[PDB]
Structure 1
Amino acid sequence: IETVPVKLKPGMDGPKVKQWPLTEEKIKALVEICTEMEKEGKISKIGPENPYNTPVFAIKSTKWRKLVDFRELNKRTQDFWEVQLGIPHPAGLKKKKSVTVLDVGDAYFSVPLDEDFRKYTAFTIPSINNETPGIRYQYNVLPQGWKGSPAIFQSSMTKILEPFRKQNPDIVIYQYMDDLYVGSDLEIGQHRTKIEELRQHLLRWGLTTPELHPDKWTVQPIVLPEKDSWTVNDIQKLVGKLNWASQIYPGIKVRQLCKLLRGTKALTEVIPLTEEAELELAENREILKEPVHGVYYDPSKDLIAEIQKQGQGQWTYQIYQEPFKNLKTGKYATNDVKQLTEAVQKITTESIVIWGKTPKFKLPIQKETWETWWTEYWQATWIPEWEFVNTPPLVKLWYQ
């Protein structure tokens, strides 16, 4: 109930990011929400002497909800929430049988925001056809979506959770942005009973609250098919997969398989699978089940996620820091954008659990299409970084 000073560093000004056009229902939804927030003292109208801007959107049940996009502010304020007031990530969270994600962002509205920092939280409700100049506001309390909010609030969160942790020392609780990740090894009914217990703790501090199974997360291997009989084409694809796999995995071998493709053959021609080849092939499969030897999470590097559209509602993905040195691979399986936004949320959630941060995504989609549609299906309180890329059709093939 008294504010923590906040900086940017010396030479990096606040966000000046444009507001992406919103549909009518979303705009109306936002002015209701905002008029209330103002009455409650949480935000204040601002004048043109505030040059800053952060985009806002509305997402979802029947309840609308405000989603501010602080991706820029977060980058520009990184020293504060990461190094000055970092929240340590527990390695044990990924080891748990069940992890429940609770939304705790209501708690942040109780704490006031440093007055010298408020201007940087400016946003704009736009109007249809630019008919009215658009409603301008800044935050007076810790805003949802800013990484400084949990950074500042962690001291209170510890107080709030102390009793629960003391009484349940094998449950692990981790705060990330507006969420609490709560993991246990308890049987599912007992796990759920403990989650409700935690809500009641949280409810006493004002926070009326709105299931992952990480131990059963196993890498999607690069799949080498087993076949009745192999054509020349089939082996060429196999040599292709294995070739590019050998740039990731120490020990992958294609020499045997390569001799099976002698000279200028018909792609359609069937070929007898030599025993030397079936050996090398079976040993390759073994290497591909295990994790990549030589790759490690580097806490100082950004995570990157690539996603390939596989058709028939199938999506494959890879998380890495150095290109192709995969830390994790997986799959996900209604329209393309809807599914893509589902994949992105699943991948981001996994990444938060596993490394305590979110990757920058390489999305196989046109910028404008994504931007028009992503909020139509987005359910999460955060937004990860993305750029827009054209998938090399071969990388799609190698991951099934």
Structure 2
Amino acid sequence: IETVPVKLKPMDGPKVKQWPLTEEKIKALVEICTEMEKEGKISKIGPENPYNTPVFAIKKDSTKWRKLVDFRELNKRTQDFWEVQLGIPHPAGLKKKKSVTVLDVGDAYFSVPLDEDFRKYTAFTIPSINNETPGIRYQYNVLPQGWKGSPAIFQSSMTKILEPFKKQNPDIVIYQYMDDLYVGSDLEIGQHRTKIEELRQHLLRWGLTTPGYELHPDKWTVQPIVLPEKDSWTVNDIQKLVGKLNWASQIYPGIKVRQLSKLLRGTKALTEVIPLTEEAELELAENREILKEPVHGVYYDPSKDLIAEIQKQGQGQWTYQIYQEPFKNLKTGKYANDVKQLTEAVQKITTESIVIWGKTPKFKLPIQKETWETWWTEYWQATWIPEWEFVNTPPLVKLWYQ
């Protein structure tokens, strides 16, 4: 081991608090931390360090209770190191594949030592129900999970160990964003699973236990904003469509209501039907054909930040939008208890964004802060944690879809 010296930006380490937990989780935390300390991965500490980092418990495919840390603040503060010193590339063929697979090798990170001057910035504590006991603090004497610097430094030995199989499977591509891994596979699903098992054995060769699961990017496309095609058109429908078109004009400059506005020159009732003239129908068909086409005049920038907006329609139907600048959408789609579906939806959207751009965007959820902070751990199943916030939404962007 040659621990690379970690040095935070010449900004102090975080001291965030810890939201309440449950005994059902505290028991699991204690029984896992016992072994973690027995195996020289951690050690008990006192108040000598002022720092502190959130901690929690989780529970697919098993009933175990793993854990991880919220290094969001830590990563946002120590970006430079892993962002510039030892960067990572981002291929593009993975999305053109048939199927993919995601792994998790946190155990591999749990088999390496770590510097001592940086452990103080890894203060992680567990709570005590009813404040009966002071915080049982600990320290990470090894590579932690969720810290994207650990993979940035381990990639060397990781690739050195991966050497054997990749030469035999050149068509396959690999990405190491975080504790999780990815694979490029443009072959049969059966062959995909056979090679996945082969790689699992290649990992077990060094004692790496790793028993949704897979995914397919080919089916992913943009959500075509489509208008209704009826034989009788009332006023209210035309008003809704005109509002939608005016709000969307910021995307497609080729949107006009000249032939339509004329029909509105007459302030009549709502249920009365009006025929769509050929000129009006011509302009409507032109706008429709323009919408289905993709975006023209946009791009992707890895230096700037990303946004991950979300909305809701009803009956468990949700939407999602991604963009760097306002109204510069890079992708859309569809996806259809109320918090479980939201959690899996954000997971799916972030996975899509990562396999496309290799970066985690910022989110905007339409809910209060305490409710999410409390109930997001229930159905969570991943090991990566992005940023987030909370916003109020008007009934205008909702018109992006039905």
Task: Give the TM-score, by structure 1 length.
Answer: 0.96
Within 2, Cα distance between the matches of 1:83 and 1:153? Answer: 16
Higher deviation after alignment, 371-380 or 36-45: 36-45
Q: In the superposition, relative to structure 1, how do residues 9 and 251 fare at CA in structure 2: closer, same or farther (>3 Å)? A: same
Higher deviation after alignment, 273-282 or 366-375: 273-282
Matched residue of 1:267: which SS?
Answer: coil
Within 2, Cα distance between the matches of 1:265 and 1:4? Answer: 75
Matched residue of 2:91: which SS?
Answer: coil
Asked whether 1:274 is paired with 2:280, we answer: no
Within 2, Cα distance between the matches of 1:192 and 1:240? Answer: 49
Asked whether 1:94 is paired with 2:101, we answer: no
Deviations 1:226-248 (A, max 9, x none): 12311111111111111122201
Deviations 1:237-273 (A, max 9, x none): 1111111222012423333222222232222221111
Residues 225 and 400 of structure 2 are in contact (CA less than 8 Å); yes or no, is this contact kept in structure 1?
yes
Residues 321 and 331 of structure 2 are in contact (CA less than 8 Å); yes or no, is this contact kept in structure 1?
yes
Deviations 1:80-137 (A, max 9, x none): 1211122212122222111100111211111222211111111110010111002111
Residues 16 and 53 of structure 2 are in contact (CA less than 8 Å); yes or no, is this contact kept in structure 1?
yes
Partner residue of 2:217?
Answer: 214
Residues 68 and 145 of structure 1 are in contact (CA less than 8 Å); yes or no, is this contact kept in structure 2?
yes
* RMSD of aligned Cα (Å): 1.3
Residues 351 and 359 of structure 1 are in contact (CA less than 8 Å); yes or no, is this contact kept in structure 2?
yes
Among residues 386, 389, 396, which one is paired with 2:388 in the alignment? 386
Within 2, Cα distance between the matches of 1:79 and 1:170? Answer: 32
Matched residue of 2:332: which SS?
Answer: strand
Higher deviation after alignment, 277-286 or 370-379: 277-286
User: What displacement does 1:357 show?
Assistant: 0.8
Residues 15 and 73 of structure 1 are in contact (CA less than 8 Å); yes or no, is this contact kept in structure 2?
yes
Residues 229 and 272 of structure 1 are in contact (CA less than 8 Å); yes or no, is this contact kept in structure 2?
yes
User: What displacement does 1:285 show?
Assistant: 2.2
User: What displacement does 1:2 show?
Assistant: 2.5
Deviations 1:278-299 (A, max 9, x none): 2222222222223211111111
Residues 2 and 111 of structure 1 are in contact (CA less than 8 Å); yes or no, is this contact kept in structure 2?
no
User: What displacement does 1:341 show?
Assistant: 0.8
Within 2, Cα distance between the matches of 1:296 and 1:385? Answer: 23
Among residues 300, 307, 326, which one is paired with 1:304 in the alignment? 307
Deviations 1:21-77 (A, max 9, x none): 112111211111111111111112221111111111111x31111121111111011
Within a 5 Å distance, the mapping from 1:127-206 to structure 2 comes to: 127-206=128-207
Within 2, Cα distance between the matches of 1:252 and 1:106? Answer: 55
Within 1, Cα distance between the matches of 2:259 and 2:162? Answer: 59
Unaligned runs of 5+ in 1: none
User: What displacement does 1:190 show?
Assistant: 0.6
Matched residue of 1:243: which SS?
Answer: helix
Within 2, Cα distance between the matches of 1:289 and 1:202? Answer: 45
Residues 112 and 142 of structure 1 are in contact (CA less than 8 Å); yes or no, is this contact kept in structure 2?
yes
Partner residue of 2:121?
Answer: 120
User: What displacement does 1:331 show?
Assistant: 1.4
Matched residue of 1:358: which SS?
Answer: coil
Within 2, Cα distance between the matches of 1:368 and 1:9? Answer: 31
Within 2, Cα distance between the matches of 1:193 and 1:29? Answer: 34
User: What displacement does 1:359 show?
Assistant: 1.0
User: What displacement does 1:216 show?
Assistant: 1.6
Residues 250 and 293 of structure 1 are in contact (CA less than 8 Å); yes or no, is this contact kept in structure 2?
no
Unaligned runs of 5+ in 2: none
Matched residue of 1:260: which SS?
Answer: helix
User: What displacement does 1:8 show?
Assistant: 1.3
Partner residue of 2:4?
Answer: 4
Partner residue of 2:16?
Answer: 17
Deviations 1:295-333 (A, max 9, x none): 111111111111101110000000111122101111111
Residues 160 and 205 of structure 1 are in contact (CA less than 8 Å); yes or no, is this contact kept in structure 2?
no
Higher deviation after alignment, 179-188 or 201-210: 201-210
Higher deviation after alignment, 264-273 or 380-389: 264-273
Aligned pair count reads 397
Residues 53 and 124 of structure 2 are in contact (CA less than 8 Å); yes or no, is this contact kept in structure 1?
yes
Task: Give the TM-score, by structure 2 length.
Answer: 0.96
Matched residue of 1:318: which SS?
Answer: strand
Within 2, Cα distance between the matches of 1:27 and 1:290? Answer: 53
Higher deviation after alignment, 340-349 or 110-119: 110-119
Q: In the superposition, relative to structure 1, how do residues 276 and 88 fare at CA in structure 2: closer, same or farther (>3 Å)? A: same
Residues 234 and 271 of structure 2 are in contact (CA less than 8 Å); yes or no, is this contact kept in structure 1?
yes
Partner residue of 1:365?
Answer: 367
Matched residue of 2:67: which SS?
Answer: strand
Matched residue of 1:138: which SS?
Answer: strand
Residues 226 and 292 of structure 2 are in contact (CA less than 8 Å); yes or no, is this contact kept in structure 1?
no
Matched residue of 2:175: which SS?
Answer: strand
User: What displacement does 1:78 show?
Assistant: 0.5
Matched residue of 1:179: which SS?
Answer: coil
